Amino acid sequence: ASKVKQDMPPPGGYGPIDYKRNLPRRGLSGYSMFAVGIGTLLFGYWSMMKWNRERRRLQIEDFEARIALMP
């Protein structure tokens, strides 16, 4: 009557199973990274140059006010 029925793989087998190592290379050259670092360093240097010169002028103004008040 009934036929054999036990745990068997489905007809045609199973799908493929990935096993190879997969560590992708995200992507940015060493030259590009160094260039980005140098560029941000230069931008910061320029901004700090401008701000420090302005601070020097402000300090001179404060010193002039004090000198006017001294006598």
């Binding site: 029925k5 036990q6 745990d7 068997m8 793989p9 199973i17």
Partner: protein
């Protein structure tokens, strides 16, 4: 490192589930006998092994 320990012990727990389903015991199954194996696989075990692997 201590992080991959947890990461991979989750998979170890899944494989312990496979052990328990095939023999009723998580680790000391005693499934392989000197004449073969004690019991046949349950009807849905191969599909779950394929899903895990």
């Amino acid at each position: 490192a201590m992080t991959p320990f947890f990461w991979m012990f989750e998979e170890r727990e899944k494989m312990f589930e496979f052990y328990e389903r095939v023999s009723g015991a998580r680790m000391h199954a005693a499934y392989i006998r000197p004449g073969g194996v004690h019991q046949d696989l349950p009807l849905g075990l191969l599909d779950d092994i394929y899903e895990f692997s």
